[PDB]
Amino acid sequence: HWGYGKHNGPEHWHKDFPIAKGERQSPVDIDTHTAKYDPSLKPLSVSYDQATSLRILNNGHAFNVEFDDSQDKAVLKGGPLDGTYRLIQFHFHWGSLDGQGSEHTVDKKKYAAELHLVHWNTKYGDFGKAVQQPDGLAVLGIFLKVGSAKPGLQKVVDVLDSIKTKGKSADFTNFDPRGLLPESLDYWTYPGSLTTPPLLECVTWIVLKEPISVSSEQVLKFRKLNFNGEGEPEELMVDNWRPAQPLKNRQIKASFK
Ligand SMILES: CCOC(=O)[C@@H]1CS/C(=N\S(N)(=O)=O)N1
Ligand SMILES: [Zn+2]
């Protein structure tokens, strides 16, 4: 199926998913000089105090931390958004080396990794209906640079040994995603897509300006995961990022002056 290798990676996805060559694909390079401050934006409201994490899953592409989204427990509102978007999962994309791994870039700079907090618009009732709508999802993207450790990441790191291979999962209750955020909520926003197949053009992207710092040891443990299943030849889960796509007829707006 689709993946990140030479034979099944981003250059191939368009054959099964022709929207890969669409008009609002993600990620993109964020040209900071060209992005424009938008006074009509609002501050982001990130309300995660009642978040209920459930489980962590190696899906063969990344690992997802899943949340109970049966009620408004962890939601994103404000900023460019109309209404309320419920957190369903978060995951990362990362590199084989510290100089690559992010999906979005900032003036062509690649970060070591990128966190995606995925939310769906409650006006559509369920995630599957939301990803049939142009305003169905909001993804909060956060860059990771290597430096000091991120304390709020360490519980994630420590469970990765138990989900090494594709299809493995583990309990992951009582995790607080507030501990993954930087201090500032300043952001860039643009309309885009999922960055994995099916590449659906349903996402309002909200990319924070301030990266979080994680330690070399934390990201090293991401790179010990496997793309393959148990008992199969080991292929390290690294370089699970899609490169920047054409901006086409889009403007990136900034929340900050
Ligand atoms: C429709 C099924 O869900 C997906 O295919 C997932 C949901 S989040 C994502 N890509 S990303 N990296 O843009 O968050 N793909
Ligand atoms: Zn992602």
Swiss-Prot record:
Result for mutant: residue 196 to H: Higher affinity for bicarbonate. Enhanced proton transfer capacity
Result for mutant: residue 116 to E: Strongly reduced activity
Keyword Translocase: no
Reported impact of residue 139 to G: Weakly impaired activity
InterPro entries xrefs: CA_dom, CA_dom_sf, Carbonic_anhydrase_a-class, Carbonic_anhydrase_a-class_CS
Protein's name in the database: Carbonic anhydrase 2
A GO cellular component annotation in the UniProt record: myelin sheath
Domain Alpha-carbonic anhydrase, chain residue ranges per copy: 1-256
Associated pathology: Osteopetrosis, autosomal recessive 3: A rare genetic disease characterized by abnormally dense bone, due to defective resorption of immature bone. Osteopetrosis occurs in two forms: a severe autosomal recessive form occurring in utero, infancy, or childhood, and a benign autosomal dominant form occurring in adolescence or adulthood. Recessive osteopetrosis commonly manifests in early infancy with macrocephaly, feeding difficulties, evolving blindness and deafness, bone marrow failure, severe anemia, and hepatosplenomegaly.
EC number: 4.2.1.1, 4.2.1.69
Keyword annotations: Acetylation, Cell membrane, Cytoplasm, Disease variant, Lyase, Membrane, Metal-binding, Osteopetrosis, Phosphoprotein, Zinc
Documented effect of changing residue 139 to H: Impaired activity
